[PDB]
Amino acid sequence: LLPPPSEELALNELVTLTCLARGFSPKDVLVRWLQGSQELPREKYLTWASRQEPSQGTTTYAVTSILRVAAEDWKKGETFSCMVGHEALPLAFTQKTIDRLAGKPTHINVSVVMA
Amino acid sequence: CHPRLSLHRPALEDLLLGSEANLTCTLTGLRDASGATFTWTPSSGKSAVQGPPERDLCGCYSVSSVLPGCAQPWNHGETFTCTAAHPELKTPLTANITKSGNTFRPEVHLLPPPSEELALNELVTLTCLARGFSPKDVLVRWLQGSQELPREKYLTWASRQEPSQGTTTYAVTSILRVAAEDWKKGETFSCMVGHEALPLAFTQKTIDRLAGKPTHINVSVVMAEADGTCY
Amino acid sequence: LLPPPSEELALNELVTLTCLARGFSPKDVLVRWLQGSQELPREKYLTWASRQEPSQGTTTYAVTSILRVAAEDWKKGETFSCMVGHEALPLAFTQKTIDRLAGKPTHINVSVVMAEADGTCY
Amino acid sequence: SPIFGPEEVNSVEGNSVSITCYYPPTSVNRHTRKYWCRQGARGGCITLISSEGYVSSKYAGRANLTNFPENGTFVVNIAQLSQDDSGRYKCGLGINSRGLSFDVSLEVSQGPGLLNDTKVYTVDLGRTVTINCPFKTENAQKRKSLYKQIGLYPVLVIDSSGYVNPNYTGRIRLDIQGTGQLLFSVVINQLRLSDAGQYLCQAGDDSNSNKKNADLQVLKPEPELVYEDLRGSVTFHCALGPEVANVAKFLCRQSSGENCDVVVNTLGKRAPAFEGRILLNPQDKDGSFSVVITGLRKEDAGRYLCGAHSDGQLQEGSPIQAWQLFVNEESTIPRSPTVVKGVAGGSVAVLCPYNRKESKSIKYWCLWEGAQNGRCPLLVDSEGWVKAQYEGRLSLLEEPGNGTFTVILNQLTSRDAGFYWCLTNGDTLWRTTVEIKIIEGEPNLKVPGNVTAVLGETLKVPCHFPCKFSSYEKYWCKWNNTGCQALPFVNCDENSRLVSLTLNLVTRADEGWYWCGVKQGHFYGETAAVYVAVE
Amino acid sequence: ERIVLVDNKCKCARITSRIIRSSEDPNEDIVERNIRIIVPLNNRENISDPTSPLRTRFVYHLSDLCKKCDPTEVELDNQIVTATQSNICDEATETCYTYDRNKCYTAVVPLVYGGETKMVETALTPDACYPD
């Protein structure tokens, strides 16, 4: 689950989240989004089909998805999640989440030299 | 069964990166063959050659045609018409096409690798997303350094329509997998998008190891002679 | 052009401006002065002669000039110009203008703004 | 900073509104992103509707945003208003965290619902009104009194028989067309701001504290927005009604400390700082007129008022009209010399800039009179006409072209000083003013006096020049209405003197005015003039 | 904050100044000088794509910010002479730190079209390269 690009936050409209799943052998999959605990309806996002990825080892597949949420809900500290269902997972679902932190850097060094 | 006639826009890769620009007009539902010769309202060299038909469900014939030289009429805003005379209908069938208006230009974003893939040290992946453009034709190519990678290194999905917030717009994605040693040597990779609405038909964004999740922001500002008789 | 000395401004009588031109190979030069956009008459300023300076390899020359103005319109904010004409300059003339704002200030405010947004400088 | 629109806008609920913002028409600005956004508290400036296809959730179905590039404007509509919609807003271009914006204040008030006990009369200040109250004949011989309420007390200060209030002086008259019926009224001219509100009106009184409610509302006019730039011109259009078609009419500018300040009158007044760059046209049949102000500077920004009053000033009780002006100052109008100098006997030449997209126009050259109100007598046109008394000393030239024409005026005298105007025929009109001063000195080119002619042999006329003109071209010409065209029998004898010309035959066919000139190919320079006879 | 001395766009720096005069003690006043720098945290050193890392060192000299070289007009006795106003702007070679909103920036990239390769041109700031 990838954080939004920083060029997007300067227009105050809607931020964009991106989910990617890669490298699974039977090509059937599900993708569901959340906000907190409330599962969102399906008419609010967009997922692509499941193409085949170009390696030389075996045959594997991939799929993407995007969800655009409002800027005011992003700056408050609301969290959002992405879930994927596959036949070959042991507990049939796996989940990743995000919020307005975790893209911020760990340290900033500024120096101003008056010489 | 019954015939039906359709018209087809010129391919995007020939208008941007090309010289020729052929329109094409097909008609399905032809029984075996016919004496259909098409009519095109600008007719400056209408070399409307058809060729051998194709087979359909349970055996059927469908024949088409082309017309060359369509850069300046298609971009200046001309109009075209295709119609043919054939047995299995009452009236000969017609079709028209025009370069679209009310367009939007795409917003391109290049995302860095996720932080978890960097520790395993086999390969990384780079995502290229284009968003919010009104006709649904795009082109995605990748570069390493300044040299174009061949097509079989990456994977591009198709253009689809995204949920509505006003006008109807589209989107696309693509991914590229590169060796995790070159990400730390300091090479650069960049993504290119070609669309009708952009000013010079292409734009690009670039990323490497320092720009994009750096865990380090170092900046030095030196202001030399601030009390310095400024004229 | 050199701004007036600090100790000469504390007395509130008259202040001195100095014009120094340097590094030119022939022995001919011009110096005029202007107030606002009005050229001052030639008997209000003193100009020395052109002499050659110590040798950093090849021979070059130098000249100086001074002008004393009232300490009221310096502090009010009029402008003064020194113009110099010589044969090697492309348009044959060059100018320097100074006033009280373009000198040593007393207060300095520095504001450094870091911008993650864009690099376009509106 | 270069962005401008209406500062204040008002409506009531259920209605529409239509806001317009302005930007300099450069190519970056036509193609960039436009936004409308709500400046709330806690920092952010959240976008509501945008030019790139974005419509919000709260504005769904009610709004759109269209962009007009050749105007330089973009318009925003909001239907079905509310009282959650009251607040400060912003137009803009680009990114919101920069400052290419402009603040707008939107106020919206509640309408009247299930209270229809009202009788209203709409009026703008300076016109007539009626306030009708029920005339009962069961109070046949009873006073038709109308109070005024300060607080809750109907104050006995207006009677209906010849007693009027000490503040409503000189302007209450009433008509008798009932007198047996229910019909009287009160007609007020010159409504004030202090003449507002409901009044305790009635006609005849049974003594049991009986009431009646009927109000008026008088409104202040809303200013038309004008968008101008540096070194350009403006035109107002005062269009008051024929009720005041023969009153003195004025035009001032509202300032900070409640002080309108006069710019023109029709009784002959003028500011000191508007000399040579203002006009006032004679009115038409219905009472409207034009005012032109050219060469606009930075400090001309503010609200302007035109009206009509008997002494030529802003006093209460006079009908007004309004405008609000903005000077862009990021302009593409080229700079020009404001003053050009010459000496007695010399020439001048002026650069006159127009727009490249209007190159098929017709060009004119004024001379600002300043006597009555302001007037352009035209001196020379681009079609081949000149004034009578300027014969032999004026012509208009089309070179260099492409942004600029020139005009030559020689044989100067010290009374030729003044302010001069140039104007094209196209749609957008910059009017440019230049001042000709006269200082003393000597003419550069040198020609003899007024040269005669012999009958039956040749003439020759010399014309010197100094040595800074040694790299410039030299020419002669013969002047007529279309201009003057160069001659091929000149020789240019010396390397730094004596350009001459002869005439092979003394007959009357070319007994005209001649010049002697200097040019760097396109751009023109100084000249002189002598007139030829034939005896 | 009243009179603008320089507003430069290759380095994106702005310097204003103002005299604020006390009436008591006319021997001492104060003269203020305000400087504003905007640092771009995501630009390259040379402005093309693959150049070098992020520019991480930003150097401003006051004598190169305030430099003024477009010619002017001076009236000496009764003459109009054209003068220059600076010693140091020999022609560019200046390294810019930001883009400028009214100029547009392009690059050239080779791609393939089945047979041979072309010389495709690419916009880097799309708001300003519109051909009109």
Ligand SMILES: *[C@@H]1O[C@H](CO)[C@@H](O[C@@H]2O[C@H](CO)[C@@H](O[C@@H]3O[C@H](CO)[C@@H](O)[C@H](O)[C@@H]3O)[C@H](O)[C@H]2NC(C)=O)[C@H](O)[C@H]1NC(C)=O
């Ligand atoms: C910053 O990067 C740019 C982009 O590379 C540099 O501009 C270009 O640099 C190249 C490399 O020498 C120059 O190449 C020439 O290209 C022409 C085609 O236009 C070709 O015919 C020549 O044989 C030569 O290879 C090019 O002049 C130059 N300028 C352009 C394209 O406008 C720039 O020099 C870099 N600046 C610094 C300080 O490194």
Ligand SMILES: *[C@@H]1O[C@H](CO)[C@@H](O[C@@H]2O[C@H](CO)[C@@H](O)[C@H](O)[C@H]2NC(C)=O)[C@H](O)[C@H]1NC(C)=O
């Ligand atoms: C310039 O802006 C004006 C704003 O009034 C436009 O004028 C009207 O625009 C609407 C379209 O939204 C038309 O239906 C009207 O006929 C226009 N005229 C009037 C008098 O209302 C005008 O269209 C804009 N300029 C251009 C070239 O479109």
Ligand SMILES: *[C@@H]1O[C@H](CO)[C@@H](O)[C@H](O)[C@H]1NC(C)=O
């Ligand atoms: C194009 O064809 C359709 C029907 O096929 C018709 O409704 C439409 O008006 C045509 N447009 C033009 C411009 O001919």
Ligand SMILES: *[C@@H]1O[C@H](CO)[C@@H](O)[C@H](O)[C@H]1NC(C)=O
């Ligand atoms: C949408 O825009 C049109 C003009 O393009 C305007 O006339 C109309 O009122 C708008 N619709 C609204 C505000 O619902």
